Amino acid sequence: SMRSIASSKLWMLEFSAFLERQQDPDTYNKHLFVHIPYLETVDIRQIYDKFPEKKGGLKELFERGPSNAFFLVKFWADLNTNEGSAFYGVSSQYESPENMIITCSTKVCSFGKQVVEKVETEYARYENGHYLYRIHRSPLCEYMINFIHKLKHLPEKYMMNSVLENFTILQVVTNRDTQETLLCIAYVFEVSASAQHHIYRLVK
């Protein structure tokens, strides 16, 4: 509701990015994880320039689609983990009262310029009173995989954080048929000292 990362139409239940290694059985690390009091609110204008702007842009998207579908997530990614059979995946799960076809676009930008986009169409499955959308053990772009290597290979965490300053990920999920925007989640990262997050309603 106002407590969760959700709009009138689409509700994120799960998100997680991960590395799993094999060997008879399998073992894996969470780089991130959310799983579903009001949420606090961030001034959308305060992050505009950390995402692509003129034209097909965040500013544009916000003004247009419903202002109840825009969120900012702050992750503290856990990087403490160990090369052979490594799979780097990301899974997520959404819920909806209604049956749709969702386009999910996810943009990795740096310095506000997009450097890589990934787009997947997702269909619904009826379970209980509603419909579920599961993206499953996606794979994670080589870009990101390298990013993580270069990161982990840094003398001190705070240097990592410092580099992350200009790394963001915009994730826009729309309705295929009605190009209505169902969810827009902005992501900004730091490395934990130990994995955690704060979720914010974006406002203006």
Add this chain to the structure above:
Amino acid sequence: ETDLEALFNAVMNPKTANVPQTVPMRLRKLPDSFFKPPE
């Protein structure tokens, strides 16, 4: 497009290799929780 190199030089090189002058997050009006991981 190893636009990822420019991510590391901006901080690590640090202002020889050219990326735009950028304003870090602790300097914007965001809530306080924004830098206080929970436990």
